[PDB]
Amino acid sequence: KLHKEPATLIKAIDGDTVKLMYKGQPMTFRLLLVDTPETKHPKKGVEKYGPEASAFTKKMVENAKKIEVEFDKGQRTDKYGRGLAYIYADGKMVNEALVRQGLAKVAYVYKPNNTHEQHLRKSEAQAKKEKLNIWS
């Protein structure tokens, strides 16, 4: 089963990345299963909806009373040393919130890090159907 652990916000970097204090040490986390338009896109720089997704994540984490991280069942860090997790702000998953609002698409999935895949896919379908942001 997956479990949530406490963390403290250090800084929001982009729509899909946040820096947190986790077990007494600073770490950068990449949100699992979602792709947001980026402001620090490696080739493109700032993409359309990049600034918006960035502000959404930042607001959500900065305003929270409690942040929790939940790792999935597979690898916990990517090739850049970022933690791979679902992040929760006062019990609300940031990953799902972005998708639900049309500010992110469900990424290419790599089993076994796919626990909330179905949940996220349902939210994306609902966002497409409502023609929100990216889908407008």
Q: Which domains are delineated in the chain?
A: 1-136 (2.40.50.90)
- Residues serving a catalytic function are 30, 38, 82
Q: How many CB atoms lie within 10 A of CB 125?
A: 12
**Resolution value (Å, 1 decimal):** 1.7
Q: Which residues are annotated as a binding site for Ca(2+)?
A: 16, 35-36
- List the beta strands (DSSP E) in the chain: 4-14, 17-22, 25-31, 34-35, 67-71, 83-89, 92-93, 105-106
CA atoms within 13 A on the CB side of 94: 35
Q: Name the phi and psi angles at 10, rounded to 5.
A: -110, -60
C-alpha span between 40 and 120 (Å, rounded): 24
Structure token digits, residue 33: 């299963």
Query: Which two tokens mark 92?
Result: 């609300």
Residues in the chain: 136
| Cβ atoms of residues 110 and 32 within 8 Å | no
| Cβ-defined contacts of 50-55 (< 8 Å, 24+) | 50/15, 52/15, 52/103, 52/133, 53/14, 53/15, 53/16, 53/98, 53/103, 53/104, 54/12, 54/14, 54/15
> In the PDB record, what is the listed experimental method?
X-ray
Token pair of 57 as six digits = 């994540």
Distance CA 52, CA 56 (A): 6
Please report, in range form, the residues annotated as the binding site.
Answer: 16, 35-36
